[PDB]
Amino acid sequence: SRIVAADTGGAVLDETFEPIGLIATVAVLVEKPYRSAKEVMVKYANPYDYDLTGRQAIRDEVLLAIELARKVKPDVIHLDSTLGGIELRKLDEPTIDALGISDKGKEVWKELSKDLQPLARKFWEETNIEIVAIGKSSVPVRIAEIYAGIYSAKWGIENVEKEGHLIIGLPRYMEVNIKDGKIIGRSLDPREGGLYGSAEVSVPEGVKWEIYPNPVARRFMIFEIFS
């Protein structure tokens, strides 16, 4: 089985540790043994002027996953939305209103559905690839979240000159390490079976970074970067 999955992302934080905007969306291709990505694509947002309210995030994920799936032709796309295991193709207002999710969730999806559902139908019609809202039980979605963290740290090493100082909130329970030109990212949860990832990075001279727990977000780490 060969799976494409997408996720956003790390976050730029305040001094207060409050998030101001998300950084990276990543789409990944995952095959046996399902511990890492075979292939990756990335799209960076503007974490300043990002609306944390609403889901520009899921819109970008679907879009990016479709793009990579056209290239790599997986059997299926996994979407990070825990809706059962349902096909995005079939998410019209009626089937949404029959879902076992909160009323607030239903409203959010009806707005999303207006364009995402025709998009998934068209994509399916010409590729036969389903987009399944499986969410939390998907290992590829988790791998994509690790990569979103990895490329958020990359976006931080790279953008720390423009900005003077960067506080980046990493996705849940993951660590990032930089040695000799590459960034390696890992789940901190051994229960997930050794999920990891990698990317190349060019470290400007004299930039330092530390990784440590976010005191106000337990189980999340901070990646802090100085110039």
Add this chain to the structure above:
Amino acid sequence: SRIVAADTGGAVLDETFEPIGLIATVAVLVEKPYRSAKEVMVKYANPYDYDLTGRQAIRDEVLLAIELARKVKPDVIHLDSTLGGIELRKLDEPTIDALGISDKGKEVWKELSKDLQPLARKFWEETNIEIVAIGKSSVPVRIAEIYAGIYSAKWGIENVEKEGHLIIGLPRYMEVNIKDGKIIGRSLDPREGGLYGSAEVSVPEGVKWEIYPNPVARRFMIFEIFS
């Protein structure tokens, strides 16, 4: 304190990673320091022709635990069913109907109790050993579930000739390793405090096995076997 507990089991999966049937039921005797089994007994089911619907599994566990408990005479049996520590002896329809579980749960139990309650009562009358429905908080229940994974793996090594290829779904967050005739099973969650188990196995010539994350069940591993 000396405790007996039982649990089923590992699963045979198809190519879609959907379970077709459970494999091993194991009862274990656990004593200080409560990290492993002092003694074990095993009953294999037929994973093909197995009804995943319903609960032949809990019926087999009670039956196996009772068998082992007559032999080793523990102080108590832990049953993998989270009701609030209640003795199976006293689970008649009226007490069930006042339990704090879902209505669907109450119906399963009423059916189950029809024969399991006289059984637990009879067994207690002659042994004074209770069967407590404690479930999730029980370490010996978790240790039993690791052994069920270990013996599902053993079942896999030894049944991999008849069947040409075998995909086994392990119980949550546990790994299996085979060295030199023994399968070692271990929890992957360090929070549980180093739970582990062991069994002997004779690995047929030229069979290979891999272990990797179940892509569609996060935090569950696959034990894959070839002939």
Add this chain to the structure above:
Amino acid sequence: SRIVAADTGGAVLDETFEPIGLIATVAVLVEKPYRSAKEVMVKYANPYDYDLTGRQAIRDEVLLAIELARKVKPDVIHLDSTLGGIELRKLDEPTIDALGISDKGKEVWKELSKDLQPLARKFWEETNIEIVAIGKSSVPVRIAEIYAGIYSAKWGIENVEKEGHLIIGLPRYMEVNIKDGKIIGRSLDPREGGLYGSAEVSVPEGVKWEIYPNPVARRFMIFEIFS
């Protein structure tokens, strides 16, 4: 950012593993990189003649945190109560009756707030330090809980002559190790990012200790001490 937090505690258990009373209340000063305490203060309860019913524990916590905060002057105090991060200062009956917690939770807090709310208000008026009911998401609160575990162990090494035998239930998923006059305590959960802490201990001649899983409370350890 510099944070004070408090928590109770470890527990003395009978032979059934049922708790009879809480042992240590600890306040800690936590700063970057938020993995440990910069400074600690402790207050032991009498675990015999302790009322597990109600919350003398949260009262002693606020009291102890305030005491340490007067000394080290952090920006904020984290309180171990998951109320949404509301300031203890403002917890009167009306705002409590509008919180999204259970009705049982509202009543406990109404009783608590009768003295805790004037207390927080007085303290704020002369210090400008808030006490925030942030709870579960707070790393400093989890670090205080590791320290309460560590000092419960200390309390056990030093009270094991008076009482012949001591069984101590450590806080959730944490281990304790003693080498050369030092107790080191660690979270067992790697997802937390390496939280740890330390205390000095004088181990009386010929006392023994063991750490192992509590069979009836999964993910909680026992610290068992002999004289």
